[PDB]
Design a protein around this motif. Structure first.
Motif, mmCIF file in Angstrom:
data_model
loop_
_atom_site.group_PDB
_atom_site.id
_atom_site.type_symbol
_atom_site.label_atom_id
_atom_site.label_comp_id
_atom_site.label_asym_id
_atom_site.label_seq_id
_atom_site.Cartn_x
_atom_site.Cartn_y
_atom_site.Cartn_z
ATOM 1 N N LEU A 32 0.862 -1.213 0.000
ATOM 2 C CA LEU A 32 0.000 0.000 0.000
ATOM 3 C C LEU A 32 0.879 1.238 0.000
ATOM 4 C CD1 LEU A 32 -2.598 -0.888 -0.335
ATOM 5 C CD2 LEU A 32 -1.572 -2.347 1.413
ATOM 6 N N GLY A 33 1.933 1.204 -0.750
ATOM 7 C CA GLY A 33 2.856 2.373 -0.812
ATOM 8 C C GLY A 33 3.525 2.568 0.547
ATOM 9 N N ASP A 34 3.488 1.566 1.381
ATOM 10 C CA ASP A 34 4.124 1.678 2.727
ATOM 11 C C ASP A 34 3.187 2.394 3.693
ATOM 12 O OD1 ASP A 34 6.659 0.919 1.305
ATOM 13 O OD2 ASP A 34 6.237 2.840 0.427
ATOM 14 N N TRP A 35 2.916 3.622 3.419
ATOM 15 C CA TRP A 35 2.004 4.425 4.277
ATOM 16 C C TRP A 35 1.766 5.769 3.619
ATOM 17 C CZ3 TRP A 35 -1.549 2.446 6.213
ATOM 18 C CH2 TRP A 35 -1.484 1.337 7.060
ATOM 19 N N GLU A 36 1.618 5.767 2.333
ATOM 20 C CA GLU A 36 1.354 7.038 1.623
ATOM 21 C C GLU A 36 -0.048 6.954 1.054
ATOM 22 O OE1 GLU A 36 4.770 6.593 -0.461
ATOM 23 O OE2 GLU A 36 5.894 7.535 1.117
ATOM 24 N N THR A 37 -0.838 7.956 1.254
ATOM 25 C CA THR A 37 -2.217 7.886 0.726
ATOM 26 C C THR A 37 -2.195 8.253 -0.757
ATOM 27 O OG1 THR A 37 -4.250 9.174 0.662
ATOM 28 C CG2 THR A 37 -2.356 10.149 1.783
ATOM 29 N N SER A 38 -1.249 9.061 -1.159
ATOM 30 C CA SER A 38 -1.154 9.454 -2.575
ATOM 31 C C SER A 38 -0.508 8.317 -3.348
ATOM 32 C CB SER A 38 -0.301 10.710 -2.668
ATOM 33 O OG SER A 38 0.622 10.733 -1.588
ATOM 34 N N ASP A 39 0.017 7.374 -2.633
ATOM 35 C CA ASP A 39 0.647 6.196 -3.279
ATOM 36 C C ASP A 39 -0.119 4.951 -2.847
ATOM 37 O OD1 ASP A 39 2.964 7.148 -4.783
ATOM 38 O OD2 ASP A 39 3.520 7.978 -2.875
ATOM 39 N N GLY A 40 -1.062 5.127 -1.967
ATOM 40 C CA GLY A 40 -1.885 3.975 -1.511
ATOM 41 C C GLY A 40 -2.681 3.478 -2.715
ATOM 42 N N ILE A 41 -3.978 3.406 -2.613
ATOM 43 C CA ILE A 41 -4.773 2.949 -3.790
ATOM 44 C C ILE A 41 -6.227 3.385 -3.647
ATOM 45 C CG2 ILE A 41 -5.634 0.958 -5.025
ATOM 46 C CD1 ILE A 41 -3.242 -0.518 -4.464
ATOM 47 N N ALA A 42 -6.733 4.090 -4.620
ATOM 48 C CA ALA A 42 -8.145 4.536 -4.547
ATOM 49 C C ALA A 42 -9.065 3.324 -4.580
ATOM 50 C CB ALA A 42 -8.477 5.438 -5.726
ATOM 51 N N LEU A 43 -10.135 3.374 -3.848
ATOM 52 C CA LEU A 43 -11.080 2.228 -3.847
ATOM 53 C C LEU A 43 -12.237 2.542 -4.770
ATOM 54 C CD1 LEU A 43 -9.556 2.410 -1.127
ATOM 55 C CD2 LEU A 43 -11.216 0.744 -0.312
ATOM 56 N N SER A 44 -13.100 1.598 -5.011
ATOM 57 C CA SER A 44 -14.238 1.904 -5.911
ATOM 58 C C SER A 44 -15.571 1.643 -5.214
ATOM 59 C CB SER A 44 -14.114 1.077 -7.157
ATOM 60 O OG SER A 44 -15.369 1.023 -7.824
ATOM 61 N N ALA A 45 -16.652 1.975 -5.863
ATOM 62 C CA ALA A 45 -17.992 1.785 -5.242
ATOM 63 C C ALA A 45 -18.879 0.943 -6.158
ATOM 64 C CB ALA A 45 -18.634 3.154 -5.046
ATOM 65 N N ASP A 46 -18.323 -0.050 -6.785
ATOM 66 C CA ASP A 46 -19.118 -0.905 -7.683
ATOM 67 C C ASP A 46 -20.266 -1.553 -6.898
ATOM 68 O OD1 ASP A 46 -18.976 -3.790 -6.982
ATOM 69 O OD2 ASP A 46 -16.898 -3.258 -6.760
ATOM 70 N N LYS A 47 -20.039 -1.878 -5.653
ATOM 71 C CA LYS A 47 -21.121 -2.487 -4.827
ATOM 72 C C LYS A 47 -21.599 -1.440 -3.823
ATOM 73 C CE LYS A 47 -22.027 -7.166 -3.334
ATOM 74 N NZ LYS A 47 -21.748 -8.494 -3.952
ATOM 75 N N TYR A 48 -21.579 -0.199 -4.218
ATOM 76 C CA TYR A 48 -21.998 0.891 -3.302
ATOM 77 C C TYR A 48 -22.783 1.942 -4.089
ATOM 78 C CZ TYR A 48 -21.481 5.444 -1.127
ATOM 79 O OH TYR A 48 -21.705 6.704 -0.642
ATOM 80 N N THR A 49 -24.021 2.165 -3.736
ATOM 81 C CA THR A 49 -24.814 3.190 -4.463
ATOM 82 C C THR A 49 -25.886 3.782 -3.540
ATOM 83 O OG1 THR A 49 -26.539 3.395 -6.133
ATOM 84 C CG2 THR A 49 -26.028 1.178 -5.335
ATOM 85 N N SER A 50 -26.860 3.003 -3.151
ATOM 86 C CA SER A 50 -27.924 3.543 -2.257
ATOM 87 C C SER A 50 -28.439 2.434 -1.338
ATOM 88 C CB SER A 50 -29.076 4.076 -3.108
ATOM 89 O OG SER A 50 -29.563 5.283 -2.535
#
Length: 108
Positions: A32-50
């Motif tokens: 996860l980039g060690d501990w960098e959020t800009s190097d971490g990884i964006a998540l998605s919302a394919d199973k997230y809507t309402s």
């Protein structure tokens, strides 16, 4: 069967957010980039809507381990928020073939 010591772990958010932001995810290891959020990884919302808001990313995790990963509030840029204090953890099992894993990240 690829690396039997690595298991793919999906980090899911229970968060019905409605803004244009995105929940990334970094970790306690280089995966996860060690501990960098800009190097971490964006998540998605394919199973997230309402009905059921569930983000998640299956970030591989080589070498079984009780890894420690947490979420981050990433704006349209690398500006973000992060793990409260009690981050999350995952144990990469040693199963060949079924390289799947789970990590329930909550964002709401």
């Amino acid at each position: 069967c690829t690396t039997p010591t690595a298991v793919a772990v999906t980090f899911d958010l229970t968060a019905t957010t409605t803004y244009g932001e995105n929940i990334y995810l970094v970790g306690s290891i280089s995966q996860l980039g060690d501990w960098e959020t800009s190097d971490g990884i964006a998540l998605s919302a394919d199973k997230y809507t309402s009905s059921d808001p569930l983000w998640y990313v299956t970030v591989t995790l080589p070498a079984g381990e009780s890894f420690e990963y947490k979420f981050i509030r990433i704006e349209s840029d690398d500006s973000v928020e992060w793990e409260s204090d009690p981050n999350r953890e995952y144990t990469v099992p040693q199963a060949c073939g079924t390289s799947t894993a789970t990590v329930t990240d909550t964002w709401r």
